[model samples]
Target chain A: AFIPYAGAQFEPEEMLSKSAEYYQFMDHRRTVREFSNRAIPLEVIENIVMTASTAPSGAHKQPWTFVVVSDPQIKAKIRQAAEKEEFESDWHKPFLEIAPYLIVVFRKAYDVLPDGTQRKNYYVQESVGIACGFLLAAIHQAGLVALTHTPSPMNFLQKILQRPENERPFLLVPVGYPAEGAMVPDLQRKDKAAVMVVYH
Target chain B: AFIPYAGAQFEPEEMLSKSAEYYQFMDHRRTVREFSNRAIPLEVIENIVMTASTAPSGAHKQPWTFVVVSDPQIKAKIRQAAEKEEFESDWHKPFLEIAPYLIVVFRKAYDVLPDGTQRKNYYVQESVGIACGFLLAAIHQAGLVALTHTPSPMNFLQKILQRPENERPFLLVPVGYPAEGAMVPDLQRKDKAAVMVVYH
Candidate 1:
């Protein structure tokens, strides 16, 4: 006979709401590039990432690592490296004027084994991507503006952050409050008829 | 020489109050399974998807497809196949008591060339996973309850949907309204200390 592990519990108020009022509120979410220099509370940042851990992964492997950068020196280094790469090409240029927080997301390249053999993992990119989405949503839901920024050749992050060989930088999310007068490109979304097809 | 394609424009609001208030509202989103047998406006669904499509992808490939299922006959067939797979799993058996909408997400297997050549796409799983995140969030933002369900050996979905062999099912989302007095697994997310690592 197998015994089930008791799961964690929370009060109804503590649980995420499923009301339509909540959904419509998120409907207006968009990517914000402008940011204010105001500092965000560290505990709030922790809570934001705590929600990311709830994202489902393949086989429940939960293959992802988030490298949070709050140190002024490191953030400055990352900004410099990112700018170096961004300035190289004019195509898709002009990304620097975005946000204040730069949280780098990395995808695991290999899983460590008890026997010390490196094992290949499936869906590394997908796993990390999902977690990032959850993280971004959580950040937005926490009353903050964030921009997903990716400069060419992110290998610079590994060198700057000194990450192990098993990790690769997948994305950089600049988080924090939007600028005094932030602006975003007005983009209309394509409706369901063009995207969703239901067939029996 | 290539010129920039004109995108949409946005008018500045008194305060980007939409970000904070709306995000506060999104805090109530949940993955709901129970749905009423009400016909949803397909256009609303489309707009949500359009939001998902805006996510940045590897190489700007935009590698993902969203298939919506609303037909009762087809939904029954998918449920039957899914239940077969669900019943066989002894580990982490997914409780499916309140599910209503079924969305099948497909990841492209290969990109076909005009001359019949096949080229593999990098980060296919990651790309699709990002889009899926966008879709789920969009669904919630649209006031819809969506359950992310995975039927092991989802290859059957491609066959049943008559999708090209190049497409692979990565996620099955059930969209609708949660049941009256619905309950979810008591779950507490991992603390930020365990999930976030700061590199100085």
Candidate 2:
């Protein structure tokens, strides 16, 4: 159900100070494909996910569902389904190497509000995607490594996770420690000169 | 316009350490409305926007256009249009009270590839939103405060900014140093148990 409330609150001075500090802190995060077997506190995970819920959405229709997997059985099933898609890509898909936690993000296609009629959501993908980024940032802030692993053809996740028809898998992110020996491809980014044009 | 290139590089140890540190850093960012007039280095802005280009996109079609506004004249124009919309919402659109930077994001609706045929992008909104999140994280990482502001009827941005019809304004983010006195609403997020379920 869609709910609207005044956004979260924090001291203006403290909020501004912390916002500056947090941006600086987050700037250092790099994606990782390796993970350690070490387990993290469930409370930390919960807190970070809570942070994600604060993201902006279209018309306050927070369209998202996160499926967290802790059970080895379910994890294995997810791994199997994910691997099936990954193998098709010849494991060119990035997340195969290192990931301790797998979070499956899903989008609510349409919801039935208190009214029996079906209501549509505008910008569902945008809303959920923003929230996912917030969750990733929060996870990193909590001292964890994460890699957004989207193997395409993620349709299998719906069946594996047994989500309702209204729920569609959106992203597969692996969070945890990086592998002991991991290396990423070498590449350069497009400089701002080429990207931004401030005419107005 | 979309471009493709080889992926980025990351050393294993460095990636882990950076990811961990970044996670910690991002956790601290808060939305702020006040901004410092101190001019930001163009090179740094370029580098961060370049980093944002690394976000994953559908068909690798990086469907996004970022319009940076630095001119006080232009900024004032935007403020005028945005305020017009905000007034319609009765000064109740969530982020108006505390946002500092206004980076107008756009999704490429139809692009003319080198081949010349007009191509439609899939998940364009989702792709651009992800890139925006990456940009916001990068901005924060750079020790800045940004508030995601969409005052509604953002079409005014397209007209005021003179954006092509093919490009639709997506997000208006205000970025910069926070005002000495800035505050945010106070609220708590729902517990993870309430939002997540392991349906294996």
Candidate 3:
């Protein structure tokens, strides 16, 4: 059984304007490698997480966790562990510490019931992937920049963060202001014809 | 080598307002299983596809394809294939036929180089997942509703769509206006404390 639903309706022009504005805004979003030592309010991070959670999940199970870390000690530990796994002397090492928050998104393989039985999560990859997309947008929408950092053998993050057995690290996003003089690759997005096929 | 990057900067108050407004707008987004037989302009779908293509991908490979189908013959073929798999006397059967468009998202497992060699795609699942999230948000922002339909053994979609061997069906979305008296589950989102853990 379902309940009655009422949704906001917009004039076509308003809808077109909003879509255009959002596209333009999101177009400016880029992955930043260097971060400044700027402090972001806890409330802002909370709101961003809330926005991410609003994403639709498979079976509405919402099998994901957003673990926000700001402590210097823990951040240092994560950096050390991550660097050990990735031997390259990359900018991520410093940016991990400089960023104000590290959002470690974990995807639950299966849910453990209160009684300790496992409840399988359907479409875990697809569900958690959508949530992370929302997360990146939310981070950018807040006028902040983030890097989608996925260190191979991310199991170290789970061990350091002390996440439960059911959760596996999916993506690590370091969120904050871009450092002064930060640089990015001058890349071009694939044109519309290349990425899309239309049938009318 | 990377180049110095400049991005749009917003004042704190403006950032806060934009964040709040986006949240409110996205909050009203709901998955509709019943769709109105409304004819959507082809350009609108194109714009949404372009927006989704902007999502960050593994190594920026942008390994995704949006196959937009509006032909009644093709739509009917897809509906028959989907219903055979789901096996339920449900609204989805009718909605699939009624919706003006079906966006079958295909994820490229690897990049087939011009030389006929395959370049491996890193984090394929995570990359495509994020792109789908962007697609759904763009659809909502365009004043349309979509259903994230993943029919298992989706190989049929590839067969019917006549896609290349390099691509695999990731998610199937039907796009259009909600039917009159459309209803959704009376569900509540998990609160902040439940979905997030913050350390300061």
Best by DockQ: 3
Per-prediction CA RMSD (Å): 7.0, 6.8, 2.0
lDDT of 2 by residue, B1-200 (tens): 22222223344454445444544454555555445454455445555565566565666566777777666666666666666776765444333323333567787887776786898877776667777777776676566667666634677778877877678877777766554555644434435564686532
Each model's lDDT comes to 0.60, 0.62, 0.84
lDDT of 3 by residue, B68-172 (tens): 999998888888878877775363487667999999899999988899999998888898899888888888878889988884348888998888998999998
- Please give, for residues B39-133, the per-residue lDDT of candidate 1 as tens digits: 45555555555656655555555666778666666666666666777677633222232343466777776777779889887667666777777
| TM match of model 3 to true structure | 0.95
DockQ of candidate 2, scored on C-alphas against the true complex (2 decimals): 0.22
Ranking by TM-score: 3, 2, 1
TM-score of the second chain for every model: 0.79, 0.78, 0.94
Runs of candidate 3 exceeding 4 Å displacement: A11-13, A88-92, A151-153, B88-92
**CAPRI band for model 3:** medium
Best by TM-score: 3
lDDT of 1 by residue, A1-200 (tens): 22222222222232233333434444555576556667666556655665565565655556667777777777766666666676776333223333445677777777788788898876666667777777776675667767666633577778877777877888777777666556655555444453456653
Q: Please tell me which predicted candidate would have the highest lDDT against the true structure.
A: 3
Badly placed stretches (over 4 Å) of model 1 are A1-24, A87-98, A113-122, B1-63, B72-98, B107-127, B134-155, B162-168, B175-189
> What is the Å distance of residue B29 in model 3 from its true position?
1.4
The whole-model C-alpha lDDT of candidate 2 against the native structure comes to: 0.62
lDDT of 3: 0.84
